[PDB]
Design a protein around this nucleic acid. Sequence first.
RNA 1: GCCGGGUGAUUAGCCAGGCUUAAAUUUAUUGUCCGGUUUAG
Lengths: 143, 148, 308, 230, 79
Amino acid sequence: SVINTILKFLPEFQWIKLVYGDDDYKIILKKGEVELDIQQLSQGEKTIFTLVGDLARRLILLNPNLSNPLLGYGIVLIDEIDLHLHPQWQQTIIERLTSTFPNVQFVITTHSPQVLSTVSSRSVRILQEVEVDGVNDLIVSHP
Amino acid sequence: VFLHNRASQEKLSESQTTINALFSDIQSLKATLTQVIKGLELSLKEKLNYMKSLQSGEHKFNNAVSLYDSVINTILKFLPEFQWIKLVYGDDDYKIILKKGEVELDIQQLSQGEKTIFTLVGDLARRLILLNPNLSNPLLGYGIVLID
Amino acid sequence: QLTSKIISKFNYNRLAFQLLLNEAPKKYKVYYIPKRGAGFRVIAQPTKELKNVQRFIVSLLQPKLPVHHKAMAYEYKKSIKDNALLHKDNNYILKMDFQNFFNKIKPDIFFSKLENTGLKLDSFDENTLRNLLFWRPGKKRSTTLILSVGAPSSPFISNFVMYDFDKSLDDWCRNNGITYSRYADDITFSTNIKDILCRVPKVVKKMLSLHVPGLSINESKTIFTSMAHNRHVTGVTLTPQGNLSIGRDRKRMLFAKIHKYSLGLLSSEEINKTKGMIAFANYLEGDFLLRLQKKYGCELITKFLMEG
Amino acid sequence: MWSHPQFEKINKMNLETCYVDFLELESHVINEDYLKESVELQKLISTLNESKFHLNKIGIHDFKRIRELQISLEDDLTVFVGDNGFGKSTILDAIAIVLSWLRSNIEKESKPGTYIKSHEVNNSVDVEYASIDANIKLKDFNTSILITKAKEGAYYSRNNELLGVKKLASIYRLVNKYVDNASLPLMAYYSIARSYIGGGAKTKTVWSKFDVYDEIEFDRNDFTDFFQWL
Amino acid sequence: FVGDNGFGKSTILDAIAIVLSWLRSNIEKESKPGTYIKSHEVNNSVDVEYASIDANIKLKDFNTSILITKAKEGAYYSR
RNA sequence: GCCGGGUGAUUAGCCAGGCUUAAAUUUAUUGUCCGGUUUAG
Ligand SMILES: Nc1ncnc2c1ncn2[C@@H]1O[C@H](COP(=O)(O)OP(=O)(O)OP(=O)(O)O)[C@@H](O)[C@H]1O
């Protein structure tokens, strides 16, 4: 379950294996017809690998009795979801995150209009600066 | 800090025999030593270097005050929201003060976005000033820069 | 002159009175009381000898200190019903509270306010007042005095202290069509104009600093409500039509109790417990007994009323 | 967090009333076998399991750039959009500050959490203190919490209200006592420093659910532990 | 102390070393913290909640006692 | 439209079965042995 969950966010990869090297263990991926080491991955794939692996570890540790631990409740805060990701991946990260963990409340701050193309009006808050009564202040407006 | 100190000394003047004053400070340090040893000797050599620097007194057109103004205006060009940047001395230390709107902020209170631009531009200008001390306009040297 | 009147009234000699003056700020007892739900509360109450001498001082000082008419707590011929009648015909309601209201009253503020009223008192009277109406918690080296609740002289003092704040807020709210009232450490505003109650939290905050230093606003107990949700003021529910009520749940609470009583299934103390609730409800509504007699008959109700 | 004599009030199915009922029952019976089979424990378990954890609303006063503001958050997803300098991160740090006290009281009661830094107070002349408040709703149970700090140089005091968090955390510890593998809520924070968390000792042999409760943020050694766990 | 067993007699000496540390700390400075009982030294059995150490010091006719205790993580009561 | 609020009447009655009515995203009921208010002996 953990391996397939990680592979869900990286469709270009085929399988992940934990080869036991004589000196020490190591993890081997496979992209295309090549075998890659984790140290040789790009920055973008590293960020997704760490984020999803950490979430899966926390959920599994905190929910031992559940048949499928991914359903556990909680709250997760993420800042700047659009780091080191090209626009192609920016349009599908949100729905995959919500579908994989359906019972977790998410608070996300964004910076680019690519993500805003796939978010319902109900869950959008826009910060604005308005000077009222001679004093500058911040307001939040629904779309 | 050193650039500001040199600019303040040049603009305020009143140094009189600055080289002689530094030499007298070196002599006083030597007398105190006669009356940790390696550090004291290094400080005496630093005092002699200061005396030599004051004796030189290039006072070129690209003086310290002009370089200070050029550096500050260079950074301010990339941050139109701010108004001015000053180096405030207090509690026996120096701190950077920036004015935005009507609120003065320290260096650590800026957001990540202005932190990145301030760091990159300042590092760009520092090397240009240090590498080209002969040109009238130091922001004209040659080089190659790789940015990711 | 106040020391002479107290001495003559209680027949105290010079030595005993002197000893009592020094020992007075420590004759208090601290105890816990249960909370409705889970938790506990802390109360401090003076001894019997100090209580009946504090009441005399309050009686002496009451006809000389003005109190604003918007304060509806610890006042003669005023209660909850009079408080709720002000906001019974408004659409939007906002409620705010204080933070540790009673323990922020100190002799420095009390004497500062007393000097402004123009009443001149001697040094001996000031010494007598300071050492009699205040509590000293902690060790004897604390040298701090707080008012505290549970003593007969505290509720009167608080109303006198908050007179300037009450007066300043009343005429500010009148000019904008806002109804304002205060009960102990609770403040309520109500109006019909839309989008006007969002500006008062800053106004009260600015007023508190100017008129009574030390006080502060608890920001976690601010409530906005309208006609589309539940509305109540200090324990009485306001119907959308604009009539005071006790609540549907309590009405069915009492109806079943009386019905079970008609079958002889009620204990002795439950009759006494319910009779007070019936009297209070009849006071709030004014027609509860008529509705009860129209359902169960006058004979049973009269027997229940005279029971015990 | 008291035994109490179970004041009758009126009939209700609130979680708190079940908590008090169980506490009152425990003070009399001593045999743990009977306690583990009591119907009150089953009712408390069912109520706790059905409730869904989610934050409700938040307000900020005089904290960093924000002067006065109140937000209401959805129960499944909410997104904040703005440019640089609009305090997008400030809201996240405010929520992390509030959640830290709840985290602290689960490991061990009366344990302090995270305070307000002295340089985070607003820089205006007329400001005196900063406050953050929040509300947590468990279906029908409502709790609130306030955190505040006074500006340095002032001589007027302010306090924090921690009754709600202490009471809510006591329920989790009590149910954890009588249940072998009781679950716990998940709280996490992925700041901007995660870029080199993956971008950049004695062997562990024992794991536990409290290992993830040491800190609320993700940084550095957490990545190493993931490899050892895998 | 004489006897062989798996619990180790050095544990007893370690307990004494913990207690005396507190006495030394207070002498150096008032209310200075000493040495606490860390989490993993408690027993791993199911029916345990906390660990305690009790000691007594006698000076002629002057008797003092000290108790040091630590409870497991997530316990209902703290010590 | 929908959902959440107010409650006279209703029932071997604090559950439920009916009829009315209200709306910016916007209440989840409190502290006694003191204080003033209601009812009684
Ligand atoms: N003490 C203070 N007084 C006034 N303004 C302050 C203070 N501290 C911080 N600020 C303001 O905070 C702003 C930055 O806030 P913040 O970092 O939350 O915003 P952001 O750029 O949206 O966030 P991020 O880039 O970290 O996601 C600065 O523009 C600064 O003016």
